[model samples]
Target: ADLEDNDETGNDNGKGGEKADNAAQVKDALTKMRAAALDAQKATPPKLEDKSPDSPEMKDFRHGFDILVGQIDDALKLANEGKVKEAQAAAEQLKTTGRAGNQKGG
Candidate 1:
């Protein structure tokens, strides 16, 4: 009975601010970019379908999102090929492009 009375349960959450560079982390970022790009694209339907032409900023944002998707795919390709550093480089490109797109507006 004494042994069961003082059991200490450790609660640890792995969430940390430390940046990690690895194939898994790179793929996670790449997949995040892919999903985000798709959602943003869906919001701005094509001119042919929406019957409304997008503004210049919208156009820029869409193009930026497209490039992000391309970069993400390239990263995934590099990751699949076991080129970890190259994949990280590609992932970095998408993050930069995404920030620029945010400035351009959707």
Candidate 2:
């Protein structure tokens, strides 16, 4: 009985340590992801100020870029809140949509 009790205690301790380590890793990954998302957002196309009535393509590009910017910003915010996977998914969607829009405009 004494040996069994000791073994159980040791196993519990090991499990707890592993949980702590995993938590730390998750936190670190989330921090790095948030930073990367923010950088990507910064690299997105800037809002154009010269959208004339004749330039429908330019107008569409500006609107699409703005939407992408919003999506990236929201994803970064989510990552900072520890929702790393969700943020990454959102960023991926934004990238896909933005690329399609850019090609359409070009």
Candidate 3:
């Protein structure tokens, strides 16, 4: 039991730090965005009779998540491709665009 435990948990060889934290943050944001998309899809109420199913507010809330996911993906790609500055910029754009409060592509 002791030997198995040691073998399973003996990889703390000083390889965990800022970069790991950064990647973790990216992963969390990506997962959260995607999950929110799913949640919004299920949570959106059906339209009333004679009303369009294409309300601007609901559409924006859902598509905002899609846009955020794409931006998050781009940031991760830039980070992996050695373009941290661009990644940071894209992340900033996501932050701003995600809160534009409409589907007008602000």
Candidate 4:
């Protein structure tokens, strides 16, 4: 424990110096997700015929966006609760499991 780092409250050791780390991880994960989505969007943009909500391509892209947002939310919630380990793991998973990450060629 970094004694000098501790504040009047004992929680300083557990919470302090940790938020930045989690936030960094979250930011990194988000960057990767967004870039992946952007690359996908650029590679195979939605065609006029596929613009409808019922289009399978539209549904697929929507699902990818949803997964990206949902995973980020989960990691943020865990970090806010001081579950840094869980949050970090969640962020790692997000990199691998994001729907955009799995999209091939697009």
Go through the candidates in order and give each one's C-alpha lDDT: 0.62, 0.49, 0.56, 0.58
Sort the predicted structures by lDDT, highest score first.
1, 4, 3, 2
- In candidate 2, how many clashes are counted? 0
Please give the lDDT score at residue 69 for candidate 1. Answer: 73
Best by TM-score: 1
Lowest summed lDDT window (length 10), candidate 4: 97-106
Please, what are the lDDT tens digits per residue for candidate 3 over residues 1-76? 3445454353865434334444555555556667666565546433322333455655665566767666667767
**Tens-digit lDDT string for candidate 2 (35-100):** 543343324323433333335555564565556455555655666664556655665665565444
User: Model 4: number of clashes?
Assistant: 1
Candidate 3 wrongly placed segments (more than 4 Å) = 1-20, 44-63, 83-86, 101-106
- Please give the lDDT score at residue 42 for candidate 3: 40
lDDT of candidate 2 vs native?
0.49
For this target, which candidate reaches the highest lDDT against the unseen true structure? 1
Query: What TM-score would you give candidate 3 relative to the actual structure?
Result: 0.47
Every model's TM-score: 0.51, 0.38, 0.47, 0.47
What clash count does candidate 1 reach? 0
